[PDB]
Amino acid sequence: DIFSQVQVRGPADLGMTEDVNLANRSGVGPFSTLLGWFGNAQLGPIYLGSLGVLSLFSGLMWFFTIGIWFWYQAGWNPAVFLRDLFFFSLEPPAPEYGLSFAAPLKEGGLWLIASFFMFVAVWSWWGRTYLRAQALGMGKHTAWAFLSAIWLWMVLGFIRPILMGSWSEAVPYGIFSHLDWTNNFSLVHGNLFYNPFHGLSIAFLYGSALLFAMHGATILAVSRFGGERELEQIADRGTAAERAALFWRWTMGFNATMEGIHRWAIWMAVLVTLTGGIGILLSGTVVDNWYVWGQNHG
Amino acid sequence: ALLSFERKYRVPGGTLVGGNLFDFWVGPFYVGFFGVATFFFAALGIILIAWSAVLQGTWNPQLISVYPPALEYGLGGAPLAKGGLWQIITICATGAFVSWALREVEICRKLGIGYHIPFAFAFAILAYLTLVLFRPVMMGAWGYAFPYGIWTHLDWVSNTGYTYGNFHYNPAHMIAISFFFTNALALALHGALVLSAANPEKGKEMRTPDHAATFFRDLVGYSIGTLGIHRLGLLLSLSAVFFSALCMIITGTIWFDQWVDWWQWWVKLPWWANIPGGING
Amino acid sequence: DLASLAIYSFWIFLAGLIYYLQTENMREGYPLENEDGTPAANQGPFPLPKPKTFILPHGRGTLTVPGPESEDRPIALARTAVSEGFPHAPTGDPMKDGVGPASWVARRDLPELDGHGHNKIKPMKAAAGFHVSAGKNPIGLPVRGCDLEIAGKVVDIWVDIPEQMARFLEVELKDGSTRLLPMQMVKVQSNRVHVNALSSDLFAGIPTIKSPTEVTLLEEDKICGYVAGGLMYAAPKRKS
Numbered sequence: 154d155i156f157s158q159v160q161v162r163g164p165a166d167l168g169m170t171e172d173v174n175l176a177n178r179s180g181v182g183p184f185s186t187l188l189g190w191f192g193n194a195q196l197g198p199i200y201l202g203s204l205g206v207l208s209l210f211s212g213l214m215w216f217f218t219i220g221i222w223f224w225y226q227a228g229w230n231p232a233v234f235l236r237d238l239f240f241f242s243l244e245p246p247a248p249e250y251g252l253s254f255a256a257p258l259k260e261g262g263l264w265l266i267a268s269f270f271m272f273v274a275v276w277s278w279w280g281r282t283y284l285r286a287q288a289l290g291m292g293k294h295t296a297w298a299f300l301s302a303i304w305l306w307m308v309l310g311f312i313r314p315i316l317m318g319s320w321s322e323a324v325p326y327g328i329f330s331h332l333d334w335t336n337n338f339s340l341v342h343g344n345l346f347y348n349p350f351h352g353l354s355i356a357f358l359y360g361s362a363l364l365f366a367m368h369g370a371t372i373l374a375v376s377r378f379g380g381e382r383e384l385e386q387i388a389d390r391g392t393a394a395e396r397a398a399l400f401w402r403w404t405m406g407f408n409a410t411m412e413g414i415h416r417w418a419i420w421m422a423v424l425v426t427l428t429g430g431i432g433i434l435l436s437g438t439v440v441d442n443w444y445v446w447g448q449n450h451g
Numbered sequence: 452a453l454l455s456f457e458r459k460y461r462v463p464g465g466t467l468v469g470g471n472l473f474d475f476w477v478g479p480f481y482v483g484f485f486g487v488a489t490f491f492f493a494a495l496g497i498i499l500i501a502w503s504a505v506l507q508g509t510w511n512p513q514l515i516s517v518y519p520p521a522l523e524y525g526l527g528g529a530p531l532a533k534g535g536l537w538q539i540i541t542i543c544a545t546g547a548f549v550s551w552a553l554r555e556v557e558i559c560r561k562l563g564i565g566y567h568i569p570f571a572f573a574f575a576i577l578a579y580l581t582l583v584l585f586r587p588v589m590m591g592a593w594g595y596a597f598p599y600g601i602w603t604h605l606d607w608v609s610n611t612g613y614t615y616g617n618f619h620y621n622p623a624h625m626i627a628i629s630f631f632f633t634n635a636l637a638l639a640l641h642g643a644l645v646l647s648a649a650n651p652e653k654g655k656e657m658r659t660p661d662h663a664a665t666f667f668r669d670l671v672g673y674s675i676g677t678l679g680i681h682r683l684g685l686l687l688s689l690s691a692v693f694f695s696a697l698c699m700i701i702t703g704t705i706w707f708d709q710w711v712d713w714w715q716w717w718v719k720l721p722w723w724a725n726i727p728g729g730i731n732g
Numbered sequence: 733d734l735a736s737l738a739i740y741s742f743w744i745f746l747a748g749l750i751y752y753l754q755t756e757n758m759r760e761g762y763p764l765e766n767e768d769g770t771p772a773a774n775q776g777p778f779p780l781p782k783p784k785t786f787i788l789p790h791g792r793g794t795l796t797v798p799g800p801e802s803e804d805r806p807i808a809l810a811r812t813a814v815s816e817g818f819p820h821a822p823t824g825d826p827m828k829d830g831v832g833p834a835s836w837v838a839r840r841d842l843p844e845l846d847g848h849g850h851n852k853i854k855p856m857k858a859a860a861g862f863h864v865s866a867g868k869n870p871i872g873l874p875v876r877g878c879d880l881e882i883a884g885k886v887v888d889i890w891v892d893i894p895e896q897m898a899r900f901l902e903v904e905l906k907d908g909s910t911r912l913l914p915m916q917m918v919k920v921q922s923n924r925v926h927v928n929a930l931s932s933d934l935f936a937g938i939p940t941i942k943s944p945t946e947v948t949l950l951e952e953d954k955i956c957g958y959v960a961g962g963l964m965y966a967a968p969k970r971k972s
């Protein structure tokens with residue numbers, strides 16, 4: 154089922170040590186009985202390290218640099234701040250400044266600072282995913298998967314603004330404002346529904362839901378045979394995996410293995426922002442209007 | 452024909468309807484009574500779709516499109532060429548889907564597993580029924596449904612959206628998107644986690660689930676677990692689709708105005724409604 | 733143009749990728765066979781992938797897939813028709829024989845070990861510092877079968893130490909012997925533990941473990957297998 158009927162607790166687990174520097178690990182946190190009814194009850198420890206701190210510090214700087222701007226907009230009034238929270242917006246520099254780093258602060262400079270902070274924040278955290286894996290002797294699938302996501306973000310606020318000739322083409326920091334920018338970005342390029350990457354991207358998004366639905370319900374359906382213990386079922390096929398494979402073979406004609414299903418997985422999700430990134434990159438650099446392009450194919 | 456370990460599983464029984472009658476296979480596929488049901492509904496539906504295509508005078512799939520009845524017909528029947536054909540086709544789809552679900556149930560039983568897969572699928576089926584049955588009824592004409600055509604359907608989406616402004620402001624739409632993005636994120640991770648443990652560094656031994664558990668605690672200070680990430684996955688997807696239905700079933704029924712405008716409720720709370728400055732003052 | 737280039741490129745990428753994806757899921761249960769066990773004639777467009785070898789922790793050897801497949805156990809099934817595609821009927825007791833929804837795999841007769849090399853799963857009595865932290869503690873509650881008759885009593889909980897999870901309940905039968913029951917196939921009520929798959933009279937048939945403080949992959953499969961099979965095979969004894 155979706156919830157455990159009974160919870161059990163033991164001494165806090167400090168984990169595998171492999172090549173990890175145990176000096177950089179925190180201490181275990183409290184146990185949540187709340188988290189316990191769904192998954193593991195154990196909070197922490199977490200690994201700090203140099204990259205974690207840089208990431209974590211730049212991360213907050215980004216968030217705060219935006220935060221002060223919102224307050225400056227709110228007339229430092231906590232009431233307005235709450236009323237107008239989704240309306241505030243930190244916008245990129247005007248098209249006038251181009252790829253200039255000299256825009257005045259109220260006119261776009263503050264946006265550059267925030268972005269610079271985000272840039273470092275994100276890349277350091279990427280390097281963090283990689284190293285954490287290295288130090289345990291694991292594959293770097295997580296860092297590479299992560300790179301896909303990074304691709305779309307790189308393209309939205311960095312690579313495309315640069316290839317277009319101005320930062321003004323980037324995404325503003327704001328709740329309603331980044332929604333508007335999105336809606337508007339499609340209007341300008343002749344309706345993104347004709348961008349075949351966009352369409353591909355949607356297929357993989359829809360698919361991710363389809364698959365994670367399929368995989369999840371399956372593993373639950375056979376957890377009565379210890380299905381969730383996937384690494385050992387990969388190393389020694391249990392009846393759980395057979396029932397799993399056979400349920401699907403009998404339904405739609407072919408099937409996965411336990412290692413296999415997880416390759417379907419990582420690629421279906423990774424293709425969302427991979428294709429995505431490409432659809433957006435060509436948008437406005439090589440193709441000005443996807444409908445017209447749809448008319449020619451060229 | 453059989454997987455090296457399949458035979459011991461191919462025993463009689465588990466059928467919901469009709470005993471041993473359709474209790475058999477065709478190549479890898481399991482038939483069952485509902486095996487037959489879905490085939491019949493699928494045959495019929497595709498036929499009708501081709502029939503629509505001649506009345507339309509195109510065989511090109513990018514062009515073919517079967518439209519519902521126009522609003523003037525309300526929730527009554529319409530002539531074939533004028534909307535009947537879509538109505539049957541819709542009946543046939545439903546027939547297909549539901550049947551496909553019940554077959555999943557029948558396979559579940561024969562194998563002795565839970566019913567989580569058929570159950571999860573029913574959410575997909577319910578989203579489809581929302582868009583072609585529940586919303587049009589409630590609105591008052593089959594004409595509010597989306598047409599069956601590759602691009603025409605994308606058009607319905609675009610037109611229906613823009614009717615209420617930027618649809619981005621539909622609040623349940625915001626929530627539904629959150630689950631879609633978050634689910635993908637989680638499918639990305641889960642897959643990557645298991646693979647990296649099963650496929651370590653060159654020459655190293657297969658990692659342990661423990662290593663996995665550790666990798667994550669080190670990364671974000673927490674690890675949900677094997678039975679967890681699988682319940683999680685199931686929850687995000689089912690949820691994504693649940694909210695997707697919700698955002699539509701309310702649109703046009705209990706809210707027909709611009710979605711952005713619905714946010715005025717927040718901004719017009721009397722305690723800050725008149726306070727000057729900001730964006731709205 | 734560029735765009736046209738990119739998209740044509742991608743549809744090609746995607747095609748070899750599926751091909752990859754597909755051949756990787758062919759490392760088990762392939763190649764295909766006929767109902768008599770002889771290799772099938774048509775194995776599909778996809779070749780078997782080149783084998784890969786897994787290096788198993790705790791000096792437990794290696795695993796190479798695809799590799800020689802064998803059930804490594806008798807199957808008590810007989811054909812019910814003269815052509816391919818029909819069910820195979822059990823020739824004895826499906827439960828005892830382990831066919832059908834009661835099937836089990838000839839996994840290793842060694843327990844799963846945690847990251848450190850200790851037995852992953854343990855009776856809680858022998859798991860230093862583990863206690864039921866939430867929910868109803870089953871231990872001591874009678875166990876009821878689908879026929880609404882009492883079959884035994886929980887005398888311990890077998891826990892998963894690395895993940896701090898309840899995997900099985902250890903139940904003591906009327907003759908003083910005990911069986912493991914998968915956690916995922918029991919309903920914990922406030923005054924009893926209800927088992928819908930097995931009727932009281934079948935609990936004794938639940939396969940036993942050779943050592944009282946350990947379970948092996950083989951014994952997990954034989955047990956889960958058996959209990960699951962009750963759902964279809966105990967059916968005449970189940971009332972509600």
Ligand code: BCL
Nearest residue numbers: 351352353355356357359360363579597601602604605608
């Ligand atoms: C639910 C949200 C909206 C909507 C919004 C969009 C948007 C937005 C997009 C699509 C896209 C697609 N839509 Mg749609 N779509 C809706 C409802 C549907 C219905 C339905 C019966 O309810 C179906 C079958 C489809 C099917 C499709 C595909 C043609 C295409 C890729 C989807 C995909 O990868 O999913 C994931 C599923 C899988 C990978 C499993 C395999 C699915 C295959 C591809 C199914 C194809 C069926 C199709 C060819 C018709 C067969 C019917 C007859 C039997 C012949 N949509 C509603 C109205 N749809 C994208 C596109 O590019 O098409 C123009 C796109 O950009």
Ligand code: BCL
Nearest residue numbers: 302306335336338339345346351354355358429430432433
């Ligand atoms: C009016 C709106 C337009 C439109 C305009 C756009 C635009 C513009 C874009 C999309 C994009 C997308 N669209 Mg569209 N789109 C429309 C209608 C639709 C419809 C529909 C009608 O049903 C659907 C289903 C979609 C679906 C989608 C997605 C498939 C795709 C983004 C995938 C993704 O997951 O990115 C989500 C993931 C990311 C952004 C990656 C970011 C990762 C970073 C590193 C995260 C860092 C976090 C930060 C550091 C803070 C840390 C967090 C805190 C610790 C909490 N569109 C119409 C036609 N669409 C994108 C695309 O790819 O298009 C091709 C895009 O740029």
Ligand SMILES: CC[C@H]1c2cc3[nH]c4c(c3C)C(=O)[C@H](C(=O)OC)c4c3nc(cc4[nH]c(cc(n2)[C@@H]1C)c(C(C)=O)c4C)[C@@H](C)[C@@H]3CCC(=O)OC/C=C(\C)CCC[C@@H](C)CCC[C@H](C)CCCC(C)C
Nearest residue numbers: 208209212274275278298299301302422423632635636639
């Ligand atoms: C392949 C495509 C999908 C994908 C994959 C993906 N994302 C990833 C990964 C992968 C494989 C990681 O490994 C990496 C990760 O570490 O996840 C655990 C990541 C990640 N994706 C994230 C977010 C994210 N991914 C997204 C999308 C997607 N990621 C795709 C759908 C999105 C969107 C917009 O859909 C978001 C928002 C992060 C959780 C994590 C990268 C973390 C990071 O880079 O941090 C840098 C900076 C900081 C440390 C900032 C911290 C600042 C905060 C303290 C401020 C906010 C405070 C707030 C009010 C707190 C309260 C929250 C309440 C809920 C309690």
Ligand SMILES: CC[C@H]1c2cc3[nH]c4c(c3C)C(=O)[C@H](C(=O)OC)c4c3nc(cc4[nH]c(cc(n2)[C@@H]1C)c(C(C)=O)c4C)[C@@H](C)[C@@H]3CCC(=O)OC/C=C(\C)CCC[C@H](C)CCC[C@H](C)CCCC(C)C
Nearest residue numbers: 359362363366496544547551571572574575599600601692
């Ligand atoms: C609820 C979460 C997500 C989900 C889950 C889900 N889907 C599922 C399942 C699950 C758990 C299955 O078990 C089942 C499956 O077997 O997967 C392999 C299924 C499935 N999801 C499918 C597709 C699908 N799921 C989708 C969505 C989702 N599925 C969700 C996002 C989508 C989209 C658009 O997002 C699609 C396209 C099928 C691959 C498969 C169900 C197959 C099936 O029902 O077969 C019976 C029907 C036929 C053989 C064809 C019938 C032909 C009709 C009679 C006529 C055609 C009419 C149609 C309306 C025309 C539409 C034209 C378009 C261009 C608009």
Ligand SMILES: COC(C)(C)C(=O)C/C=C(\C)CC/C=C(\C)CC/C=C(\C)CCCC/C(C)=C/CC[C@H](C)CC/C=C(\C)CCC=C(C)C
Nearest residue numbers: 219220223268269272306307309310311324326327328331
């Ligand atoms: C409670 O009040 C305090 C002050 C305590 C707070 O902390 C509150 C803070 C909040 C109010 C913060 C609110 C923050 C949000 C509303 C943020 C929303 C952010 C988004 C919706 C972002 C969407 C998209 C962002 C994109 C795509 C960013 C892309 C960035 C980049 C790729 C970076 C590019 C780098 C640049 C241009 C500079 C590079 C320079 C070099 C030298 C390399």
Ligand SMILES: CCCCCCCCCCCC[N+](C)(C)[O-]
Nearest residue numbers: 349350352353356360420421750
């Ligand atoms: C992981 C393999 C599954 C990939 C699904 C491929 C089918 C998607 C079809 C999308 C139709 C797209 N397009 C380009 C015309 O917009």
Ligand SMILES: CCCCCCCCCCCC[N+](C)(C)[O-]
Nearest residue numbers: 402405406407477478479480776
């Ligand atoms: C993006 C393409 C989606 C449609 C693909 C449908 C394939 C159905 C699976 C057929 C497998 C066949 N079999 C059993 C004869 O081997």
Ligand SMILES: CCCCCCCCCCCC[N+](C)(C)[O-]
Nearest residue numbers: 406407408750754775776777778
């Ligand atoms: C978009 C998803 C499409 C799925 C790709 C179809 C793969 C079909 C594989 C059929 C395998 C045939 N076999 C060997 C099982 O008989």
Ligand SMILES: CCCCCCCCCCCC[N+](C)(C)[O-]
Nearest residue numbers: 526527528538539541542545584
């Ligand atoms: C799954 C059902 C989906 C709806 C399919 C269309 C049904 C239309 C019914 C109209 C028949 C006539 N009328 C108006 C007299 O009721």
Ligand SMILES: [Fe+3]
Nearest residue numbers: 368372383645
């Ligand atoms: Fe999994």
